[PDB]
Design a binder for this molecule. Structure first.
Ligand SMILES: Nc1ncnc2c1ncn2[C@@H]1O[C@H](COP(=O)(O)OP(=O)(O)O)[C@@H](O)[C@H]1O
Ligand SMILES: Nc1ncnc2c1ncn2[C@@H]1O[C@H](COP(=O)(O)OP(=O)(O)O)[C@@H](O)[C@H]1O
Ligand SMILES: [Mg+2]
Ligand SMILES: [Mg+2]
Lengths: 350, 304, 220, 304, 220
């Protein structure tokens, strides 16, 4: 019986380990579901924000057309008043110089009948032209006013659309905060959080490796620009390279506090190789500077550049945000050379 | 032995007489055309006479003088000015035309309905008409000068008052119309009689045979009466159609003439009453001519 | 009687006298021949009887009514009773036979159906029913004379007067025409035939013969 | 066998035909009256037309050429154009009317004693008139039109028969003239035909006997030709007398009208040369109508 | 001869044939009677001879000159040679006897004096010289017929045609008219009388008789 205790104890430990593994698997599955939900929420917020910006731009475009229509309407009103005065005086002159035949008002004695007839015909022709022009301008003004009113009605629809988008964005933001809070509470276990961090870090390496093997940038690299790279964003550094993030996991990049929607500028010219959403880092933009030198910008709320697009130094590539489950807005800056992460502080200018 | 109804025999005779005209096409057609033309010409002459008479009656106004007030003049000011003018001596009467009444008068003319509507507020000057007590031209000129200097008007208009010339022209037209109408009526009356005489002479044998039998005179006479009546009716209808086709052209010509000036004029055609009188005159003339000629020629025919 | 004269005499404007104191009487149904010479008063007598020309001396009575001074407005009514046949067979060449025979009826304004039936009866009686729709030009002389007789007799005349009806026909057709007149007399129609042909009158002595000689009527 | 000469037979026929008209006075008098009236109608119309034409020509026969400048041309260029026109030949005499002067003329025409207000100074375009220096009307008109086209003048209204135009004189006058001529021809050509047809019918037996004996057709026809010629001649004379009487009737009425106007005028009768033309027309119509109608009616009369 | 036929025949529009293969010859001076029945072709023959109606089958020769297709402009010249007498004694009632008898001469436009002498001679020959200035109305029937004969014969015709001249006269005057025709024939004027009176023709057998029967001419 003494020898059989060890095997029985292992089964009990294995059952507890299996139960713990099953609980960990259920917790991991719940975390994966929470991560999937957060990714949908984060992507939805960016899509909603882009729609809001588009609608705002459309409204701005309408505004200028509204001003042009108002100026045209003012000019048309001035022309209408002038032509109305002209037509009124011409009609009064005709009322004065009727010259009706049936009342014996014809053939004034000792006058140039041909010349007076020519005067009358010219006056009538001028009246006809004036009334035709007045009708034309009035019709054009009425059509423009009808179109201008329709444009205002269309703006109303745009405003309605923008209001609905704003409400959805607010609801999405609240849900994302709740999703983040649930993940953080469930990540209270030190062991669970460390394993998740390793998988995200492992996931980043695979994506970086695939991108590196796809686009072989012919650039000269950023080696010659050591210590002179402009700061991608203006803000206070929250976490330095090599700082202990959690347990035995140390940050591989520089975390700089940034305001929501803050513009993020590329440190050096390069070609974008990865502009997708990555678990644990939010929106990540990968720029390849050639010779194996690449720069990564994560946690961006929205990405403006797409994969394969060329970016110049100082150009806005993405907007800083809290993507990737961050509790506050920030921008994650990482510099990688030969697939090895280097301290950003040694590259950025002091 | 049964006899047809009084109306039936007359209707049958009328139908037979109408059918008879097809026997000799050329002569009947020519006489009908001449009758139509000779009845149309007096109609046109009378139409011109009536138009001239209407114009002369219209021009009968005693050289009425028109006064135009300023467009912006207040209505109470216009009323006060009208009262003062009425009080002033040498003015027979004063008539005030409101701006909207003048607007309606102007809108009566063609081509002005659209402009008035398009204008937000059409505002014609208040037109006032003053009839001088004395028709003398010197008095008219003096009164016009005084009204212009009255310091309450913007313009003054005066009429032509050419009554005598139009009266003389009307008298001349009346004489010409009477003479030509009389000549044409006599010509058409006499033309019918000759054709009836020739027709009676054509069928001498049948008339002799009928009179040899105990035929009455009225029976022999009726067909010629109805032929004359048909001649008259057809001639009058053709004359009315020709008169209409002539008045359309005359109206077109007068409209073209008046178009040279900005005003327009329209001719007053013969009324519904005139056409009925024309038909009655044609029928009466034809029937009387046929009766007299046929009877006179018929008395001189013996059965053997 | 059907007609009577009282010392009637006619004097022409020229001064020549056709008739001088002629007196004869006709009873209804009788027939007479009124023979005369190349002159005499046969045609003048036939003109007088039907009031075409008025007399001068005597008086004429038709049915007891004086015809001496009949007003000109009553002549048509008188002529309606008398049928007249002439040597020339006066016919309207333009019209059809049915129209020529129907003229006496149409003059009175009779209904079309009665006119048709009566004209058909008369034409059948004279033997010309077949050619009722043809023109008079196509007919021969005897047919034209028979059409004339039918036209004369259509209107049921009380007295029928013939003025040498057989002038333009050879004796062969003369016999037929005289037999037709005899048939009409048998029907009850008074007749006064007039002819200068002595042979024809001598052929049939049944009917009283009046000889007219230089305006005098022997009546024997 | 002695035979009469060519002229003797014709003269005898003429005299006999003239004498024959008295056999039927009424029938041959009514036709003469109808012909006279029908022929006198157009004669009187022509007389009035000639009188009015003479009046129109008499009133004034000057020559002046008017050119209308375009409204677009500014005032300073007017002096330059005036100088250029003066420099060029055939432009010796020139008169210029300012737009203000034209406005004053228009105000006077309507009866206003003073220039009407509320019309502005741009109511009418400036107008220049050039006298014809060259007697060649066509060449002068062509040169003026070319010069106006070169200078950009909107219109070149050379003096002409504006009243005649292409509306009244072009169509209505021609239609009236054609209608009156047709009436004259038909009425005369008709009644003459009917009368001769009636005369031929009245002589059916004589014509039959004449044809049977062996008379030639021309012998039968000639008397009616001469009867028609006499009809035409007498009708023309009667028409001349009727027109003279009508002129006598209208003399007073025309005198009253002519006195009122400046131009003193007197009615003028038909010229002595016109009377010969009238008689020739009458006899020609009579002869032609008689020949045609008599021959056509005489074709259909067999000897037996 | 004065006239000759060569198988001449006439067919009317209706389809009835008056003449069928008629052939006869006349020598100058002869006289003929041309007897026929009520129908036959007497009147049609007299119409054909004087060219009033043209034939259809054969040819007609007047004096060796064909008359079959004589142009219409030459008919008057032919008719001038032929005198025609009709039963109706066609006379112009308006004019005087001297005018009626003088018409054939005046048609040729002959001088007045010659016309007067010739007309007086003709009227004296016919015995009417006394009444040369009277109207035809006053004359009696026989006088009118004699005036007609004089008018026919005034112009010295080569051939004289009579169409039943004795239709309207009793036999007493028939004898006188026939004797007058005989005198004219003795003068040397060819005659072709036409009558249906068998008695008159049988009275005088000297002259050749041609019988016309239903359009056929026996010539016996
Ligand atoms: N209109 C007339 N004027 C004068 N005499 C006439 C008229 N008509 C006939 N006569 C004559 O009167 C007489 C009557 O003759 P009439 O009876 O007509 O003969 P028939 O019977 O043969 O025709 C005759 O002598 C005739 O010439
Ligand atoms: N115009 C015509 N149309 C048709 N047939 C006719 C015409 N005239 C005569 N006929 C016919 O031709 C034939 C000739 O007859 P006709 O010689 O005239 O007799 P008659 O000698 O007694 O006068 C007759 O049968 C007649 O009916
Ligand atoms: Mg008799
Ligand atoms: Mg015969």
């Amino acid at each position: 019986s003494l020898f059989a205790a060890t095997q029985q104890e292992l089964t009990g430990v294995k059952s507890e380990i299996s139960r713990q593994q099953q609980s960990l698997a259920e917790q991991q599955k719940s975390l994966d579901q929470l991560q999937q939900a957060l990714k949908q929420q984060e992507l939805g917020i960016n899509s909603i924000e882009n729609q809001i910006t588009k609608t705002k731009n459309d409204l701005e475009n309408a505004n200028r057309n509204i001003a042009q229509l108002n100026s045209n309407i003012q000019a048309l009103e001035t022309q209408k008043q002038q032509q109305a005065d002209k037509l009124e005086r011409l009609l009064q002159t005709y009322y004065l110089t009727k010259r009706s035949l049936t009342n014996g008002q014809f053939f004034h004695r000792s006058a140039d009948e041909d010349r007076i007839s020519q005067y009358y015909q010219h006056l009538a022709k001028s009246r006809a032209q004036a009334i035709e022009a007045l009708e034309k301008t009035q019709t054009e003004l009425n059509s423009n006013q009808k179109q201008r009113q329709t444009e205002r009605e269309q703006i109303e629809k745009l405003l309605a659309e923008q209001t609905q988008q704003r409400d959805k964005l607010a609801k999405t933001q609240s849900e994302r905060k709740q999703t983040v809070k649930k993940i953080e509470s469930s990540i209270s276990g030190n062991k669970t959080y460390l394993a998740e961090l390793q998988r995200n870090e492992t996931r980043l390496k695979a994506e970086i490796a695939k991108a590196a093997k796809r686009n072989a940038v012919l650039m000269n690299g950023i080696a010659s620009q050591r210590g002179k790279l402009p700061w991608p964003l203006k803000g206070r550094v929250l976490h330095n390279f090599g700082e202990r993030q959690t347990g035995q996991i140390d940050w591989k990049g520089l975390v700089i506090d940034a305001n929501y929607g803050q513009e993020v500028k590329a440190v050096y010219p390069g070609t974008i190789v990865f502009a997708e959403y990555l678990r644990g880092y939010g929106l990540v933009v990968l720029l390849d500077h050639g010779k194996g030198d690449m720069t990564l910008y994560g946690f961006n709320q929205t990405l403006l550049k797409k994969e394969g697009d060329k970016v110049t130094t100082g150009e806005t590539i993405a907007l800083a945000g809290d993507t990737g489950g961050q509790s506050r807005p920030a921008l994650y800056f990482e510099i990688r050379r030969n697939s090895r992460a280097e301290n950003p502080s040694q590259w950025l200018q002091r | 032995a049964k006899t047809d109804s009084f109306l039936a025999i007359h209707f049958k005779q009328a139908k037979a007489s109408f059918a008879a005209l097809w026997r000799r096409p050329l002569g009947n057609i020519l006489t009908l055309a001449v009758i139509s033309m000779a009845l149309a010409l007096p109609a046109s002459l009378y139409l011109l006479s009536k138009n001239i008479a209407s114009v002369a009656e219209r021009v009968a106004e005693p050289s009425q003088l028109s006064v135009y007030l300023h467009i912006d003049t207040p209505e109470p000011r216009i009323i006060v000015l009208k009262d003062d003018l009425e009080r002033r001596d040498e003015i027979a009467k004063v008539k005030y035309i409101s701006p909207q009444q003048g607007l309606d008068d102007l809108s009566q003319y063609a081509g002005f309905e659209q402009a008035i509507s398009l204008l937000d507020n059409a505002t014609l000057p208040a037109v006032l008409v003053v009839t001088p007590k004395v028709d003398s031209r010197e008095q008219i000129q003096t009164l016009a000068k005084a009204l212009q200097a009255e310091e309450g008007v913007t313009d003054v208009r005066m009429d032509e008052d050419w009554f005598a010339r139009l009266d003389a022209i009307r008298h001349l037209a009346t004489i010409v119309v009477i003479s030509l109408s009389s000549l044409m009526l006599m010509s058409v009356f006499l033309i019918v009689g000759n054709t009836l005489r020739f027709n009676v002479q054509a069928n001498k044998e049948e008339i002799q045979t009928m009179k040899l039998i105990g035929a009455t005179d009225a029976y022999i006479l009726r067909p010629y009466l109805y032929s004359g009546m048909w001649f008259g009716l057809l001639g009058a209808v053709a004359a009315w159609l020709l008169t209409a086709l002539m008045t359309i052209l005359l109206n077109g010509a007068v409209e073209a003439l008046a178009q040279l000036y900005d005003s327009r004029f329209r001719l007053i055609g013969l009324g519904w009453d005139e056409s009925l009188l024309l038909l009655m005159l044609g029928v009466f003339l034809g029937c009387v001519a046929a009766k007299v000629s046929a009877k006179r020629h018929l008395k001189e025919i013996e059965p053997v | 009687g059907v007609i009577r004269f009282q010392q009637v005499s006619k004097a022409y404007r020229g001064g020549r006298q056709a008739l001088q104191k002629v007196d004869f009487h006709l009873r209804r149904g009788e027939m007479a021949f009124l023979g005369g010479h190349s002159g005499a008063g046969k045609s003048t007598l036939l003109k007088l009887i039907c009031a075409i020309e008025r007399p001068t001396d005597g008086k004429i009575s038709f049915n007891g009514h004086d015809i001496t001074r009949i007003p000109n407005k009553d002549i048509p009514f008188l002529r309606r009773n008398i049928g007249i046949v002439f040597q020339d067979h006066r016919l309207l060449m333009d019209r059809s036979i049915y129209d020529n025979v129907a003229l006496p009826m149409r003059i009175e304004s009779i209904s079309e159906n009665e006119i048709k039936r009566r004209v058909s009866a008369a034409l059948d009686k004279t033997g010309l029913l077949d050619k009722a729709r043809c023109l008079p030009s196509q007919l021969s002389g005897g047919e034209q004379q028979r059409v004339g007789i039918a036209r004369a007799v259509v209107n049921r005349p009380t007295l029928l007067l013939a003025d040498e009806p057989t002038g333009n026909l050879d004796p062969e057709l003369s016999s037929r025409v005289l037999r037709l007149f005899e048939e009409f007399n048998r029907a009850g129609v008074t007749i006064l035939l007039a002819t200068h042909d002595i042979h024809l009158v001598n052929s049939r002595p049944q009917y009283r013969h009046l000889e007219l000689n230089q305006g005098f009527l022997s009546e024997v």
